[PDB]
């Protein structure tokens, strides 16, 4: 109903300004006569009333305002000479009415404009030119005031309408931008466009190589037994916020966070030659950060970390509550490794050992090989 409010606001301000203009003409007039005063009171009263009675119903009220305007202006113009300036107000109103009324009634609006024109061609001819009522000099001053008012009313009304439109646009843009930012945060941009489209197609993307890292907490239930649930959720939020900052800061992507488990995937949105090395470095940094952090109990929080690599499948699933997901054998491998990993250690299979030995240190203990750290030498 914003458009209706815009129309109503502009018409109300228009009525106020026109009444303000008319009052000055009435006060300035001297020795003009009472016959004109009787019409002037009627016109001013109706103009002031119509904004207060705007809620009777329908589009008939704004049209009645214009009917009153036309009748009053024609009546005043007929008696006085043509040089007063009744012609100019018609021309202002012709352009003003189209803006005042909505698009749905443009045809009607056009007719109104034509009507105004139909009067103007008559006004020069039919009306007695240069009819002199009492002082003429006041008539010339009236012409000057008519010109100034005709300009000012249109300027003010148009500017007010444009201001209202700009305000509405700004609010619209801010409201939309917040939601767009949230959506961009909580899914990758490329798949968001696919999701938005009305047409529904199953999203499946095949990726030749990728690497997955799984991290989990040890003895979380024991910690839960001695702590209030609300504080426990807060602790989890703090831990995952720190991990999320580190992940964003390395550039890797995190698919989801299920309870204690933390899942990271490398290279799915864009393949890279050195995904595994980056994942290993990130895992080392994550272990250090987790070791440093402290829980409410004060005991250190150990983390079991398992890494895997291989081809994967990506895409959403279901018809409700979508999220990016990933699939493949590497996920099964990583889950098994993480499950069998020792406390405070990172474990990887033989295949990953084939890749990471060159630039990283893997030692001790399908057969696996613990990931101790990076080579000191450079």
């Amino acid at each position, epitope marked *: 109903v914003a458009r209706r409010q815009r129309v109503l606001t502009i018409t109300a301000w228009l009525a106020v300004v026109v009444t303000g203009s008319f009052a000055l003409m009435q006060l300035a007039t001297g020795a003009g006569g009472w016959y004109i005063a009787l019409i002037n009171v009627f016109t001013a009263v109706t103009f002031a009333i119509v904004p207060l009675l705007h809620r009777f119903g329908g589009l008939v009220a704004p049209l009645t305002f214009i009917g009153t305007a036309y009748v009053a202006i024609f009546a005043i113009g007929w008696d006085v000479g043509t040089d007063a300036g009744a012609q100019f107000f018609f021309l202002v109103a012709a352009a003003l009415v189209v803006l005042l009324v909505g698009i749905e009634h443009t045809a009607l609006a056009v007719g109104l404009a034509a009507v105004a024109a139909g009067l103007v061609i008559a006004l020069e001819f039919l009306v007695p030119p240069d009819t002199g009522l009492q002082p003429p000099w006041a008539m010339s001053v009236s012409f000057v005031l008519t010109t100034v008012s005709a300009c000012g009313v249109a300027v003010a009304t148009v500017w007010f309408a444009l201001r209202d439109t700009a305000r509405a646009e700004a609010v619209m843009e801010a409201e939309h931008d917040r939601s767009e930012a949230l959506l961009a945060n909580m899914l990758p941009a490329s798949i968001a466009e696919r999701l938005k489209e009305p047409e529904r197609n199953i999203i499946a993307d095949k990726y030749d190589e990728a690497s997955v890292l799984f991290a989990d907490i040890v003895g979380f239930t024991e910690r839960a037994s001695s702590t209030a649930p609300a504080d426990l959720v807060r602790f989890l939020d703090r831990l995952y916020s720190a991990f999320d900052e580190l992940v964003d*800061q390395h550039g890797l992507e995190k698919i989801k966070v299920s309870g204690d488990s933390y899942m990271v995937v490398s290279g799915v949105p864009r393949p890279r030659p050195d995904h595994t090395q980056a994942l290993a470095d990130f895992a080392l940094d994550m272990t250090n*950060v987790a070791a440093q952090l402290k829980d409410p109990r004060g005991n250190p929080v150990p983390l079991r970390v398992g890494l895997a690599t291989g081809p994967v499948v990506a895409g959403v699933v279901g018809s409700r509550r979508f999220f990016y997901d990933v699939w493949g054998d590497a996920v099964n491998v990583a889950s098994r490794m993480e499950s069998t990993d020792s406390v405070g250690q990172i474990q990887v299979p033989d295949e990953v050992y084939e890749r990471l030995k060159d630039d990283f240190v893997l030692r001790e203990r399908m057969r696996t090989w613990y990931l101790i750290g990076r080579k*000191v030498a*450079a």
Partner: nanobody
Amino acid sequence: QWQLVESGGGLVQAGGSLRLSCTASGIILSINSMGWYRQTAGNEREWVAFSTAGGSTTYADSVKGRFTISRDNAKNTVYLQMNSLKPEDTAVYYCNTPAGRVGGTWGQGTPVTVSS
């Protein structure tokens, strides 16, 4: 003494260029990541640049393309090229590893002011 000292800040005009230096004693930079954060006052300190062990680099959206993070392993230092500076970048810039970041143990930073 595990410490990091920053240097190179000062006064410049909008559109100038700076090179902030971060030298650390007590660790080996080749095996540790590094990150440059900035603090204005309207927020708590936000990360603008990050360099990993291996050469990968990342930057914040508000600053991508203008600031460049590099390493010098022999000197044990990290350098931040700053270009096309704007009034929004006036701040105190700090340098750390993630461990120090989440532990709260920093140095004194270096001031950078953008004005005429």
